[PDB]
Design a protein around this ligand. Structure first.
Ligand SMILES: Cc1cc2c(cc1C)N(C[C@H](O)[C@H](O)[C@H](O)COP(=O)(O)OP(=O)(O)OC[C@H]1O[C@@H](n3cnc4c(N)ncnc43)[C@H](O)[C@@H]1O)c1[nH]c(=O)[nH]c(=O)c1N2
Ligand SMILES: CCCCCCCCCCCCCCCCCC(=O)O[C@@H](COC(=O)CCCCCCCCCCCCCCC)COP(=O)(O)OC[C@H](O)CO
Length: 452
């Protein structure tokens, strides 16, 4: 079999892999990115397509333009289950044509020196003497099986986790997730019969009956075009998401023309803290494969880009030291936990609480202003729920005359702070990963028990 020598092999070309490729480009490295999809479909996984402008501003990722930017977003309207209370949170973002933008990032990375093979699947790892050393690839364009050696593999395969899952199970880089730590989500893009009101605002509808463990959304892509969908928690035995969608669509999108559909589809999305380590010998894991998604709102394209940024940084350092061991690549973890992962861990706790609340709880808490809109934003963006804000919340609901999980909010805030602190003390070397992981697991185990 043909053998080729590369510095870096990136497996997957979605927002995570493409970000890694772009950030590593123009540096004189020999880089190959592969994706199983044909070029014109790369980036087309089902998504709401909404991403904060701040991510592009912080990471130096190409700004969306032309047909790539479908609609400018100025904020989100969050609806209570009874739709009687709407919270508005302001913030600039983009409703993107995801495949078009993703493909442009890849084409620019390619112009900047990255080699790209589409219709090419990494079939199995090359794993020797404890290191990932590359991959066996099947290129369906040229109909060739190829062995590619690399100093580092960037595993960016999305939820499939289709490369790292083939490594020896004792390695921390093969970590799986609980079925209840992901949602299944489904969306369609449709034209509307009536102009969309406040089309610069996304709509998110909380409802435990119509989207248990997730939410419904209505994300305008123009004055007369909308991405509408829902997510529901996995591992709970819920019926087909397609059936939830059909049953409740009219509640959230009475205005759509069901004869003018542009796209439809679903996929899984992780909703938890990141992989305990995103680095091991010869390999870094990013994006959905590394569980980079915000656990409370389900947004993962921004954090995918952050993970690509951190991967590129760690890889450049490893080429300086010549050390591609877990320790040599460990900055991946330090960078990612600082930039997003510690917040994710806090939000993993908060999500578990929110998923257990009843519609009556959410209606009451929103109507009574249990927390401010700005407090919700602080939780979403920093992962902080200050003990103070918790105290005010408890005073607000002190008149509630029935049993409610809402009264546990102070304890939830305490657990959030505790896990955030553990993440701010992320292990400085692989030798401490195990004991730290057990501490985190214990916090989660105890927290789960507190809600049962
Ligand atoms: C319905 C729905 C709705 C939303 C969202 C998800 C879902 C399912 N999310 C989450 C967001 O879509 C998601 O987190 C990112 O797109 C993940 O990007 P990745 O690059 O990690 O994976 P992604 O899955 O996009 O890419 C993985 C790539 O790897 C390739 N691949 C896999 N195995 C391979 C192999 N062995 N060899 C070669 N190639 C391989 C695949 O072909 C694919 O192109 C979201 N996020 C957000 O920010 N805003 C939102 O509006 C939403 N809404
Ligand atoms: C409930 C858990 C599962 C939910 C997931 C369901 C499935 C989701 C599938 C669809 C996902 C759509 C994703 C939409 C993303 C929005 C755009 C976005 O990126 O978010 C921005 C932020 O917008 C928001 O803050 C959204 C807030 C709404 C969150 C929804 C919470 C619902 C629960 C609240 C109810 C309150 C009830 C009161 C009771 C206490 C900022 O981006 P960022 O958070 O990644 O980071 C920015 C910063 O630079 C950090 O680097």
């Amino acid at each position: 079999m043909k053998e080729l020598k590369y510095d870096v092999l990136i497996i997957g070309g979605g927002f995570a892999g493409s970000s890694a490729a772009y950030q590593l480009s123009r540096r004189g490295l020999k880089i190959l990115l592969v994706d199983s999809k044909p070029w014109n479909r790369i980036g087309d996984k089902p998504c709401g397509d909404a991403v904060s402008k701040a991510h592009f501003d912080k990471l130096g990722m190409p700004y969306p333009k032309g047909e790539e930017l479908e609609n400018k977003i100025n904020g989100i309207k969050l609806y209570s289950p009874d739709m009687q209370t709407v919270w508005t949170v302001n913030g600039e973002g983009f409703e993107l044509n995801a495949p078009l933008y993703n493909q442009r990032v890849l084409k620019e990375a390619q112009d900047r020196g990255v080699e790209i093979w589409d219709l090419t699947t990494a079939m199995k790892p090359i794993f020797e003497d404890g290191y990932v050393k590359g991959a066996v690839l099947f290129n369906r364009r040229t109909n060739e099986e190829l062995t590619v050696y690399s100093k580092v593999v960037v595993e960016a395969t999305g939820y499939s986790r289709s490369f790292r899952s083939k490594l020896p199970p004792e390695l921390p880089i093969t970590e799986d997730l609980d079925d209840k730590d992901a949602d299944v989500a489904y969306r369609e893009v449709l034209l509307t019969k009536e102009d969309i009101e406040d089309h610069d605002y996304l709509r998110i509808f909380i409802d435990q009956e119509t989207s248990p463990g997730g939410y419904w959304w209505y994300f305008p892509k123009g004055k007369n075009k909308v991405n509408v969908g829902l997510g529901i928690q996995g591992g709970m035995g819920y019926p087909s998401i397609h059936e939830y969608y059909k049953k409740y669509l009219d509640k959230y999108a009475p205005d759509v023309d069901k004869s003018k559909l542009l796209v439809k589809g679903g996929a899984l999305v992780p909703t938890r803290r990141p992989l305990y380590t995103m680095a091991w010998n010869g390999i870094i894991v990013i994006g959905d494969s590394g569980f980079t998604v915000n656990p409370v709102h389900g947004g993962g394209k921004g954090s995918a880009m952050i993970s690509g940024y951190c991967a590129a940084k760690a890889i450049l350092s490893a080429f300086e030291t010549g050390d591609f061991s877990a320790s040599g690549l460990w900055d991946m973890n330090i960078c990612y936990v600082n930039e997003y992962g510690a917040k994710q861990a806090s939000l993993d706790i908060f999500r578990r609480f929110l998923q257990k609340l009843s519609n009556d709880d959410i209606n009451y808490g929103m109507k009574k202003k249990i927390i401010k809109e700005e407090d919700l934003l602080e939780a979403s963006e920093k992962g902080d729920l200050h003990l103070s804000v918790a105290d005010k919340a408890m005073r607000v609901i002190s008149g509630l005359g029935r049993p409610s999980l809402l009264f546990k909010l102070k304890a939830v805030a305490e657990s959030m702070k505790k896990i955030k602190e553990l993440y701010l003390n992320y292990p400085r070397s692989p030798s401490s990963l195990g004991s730290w992981r057990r501490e985190v697991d214990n916090v989660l185990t105890e927290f789960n028990k507190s809600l049962s």
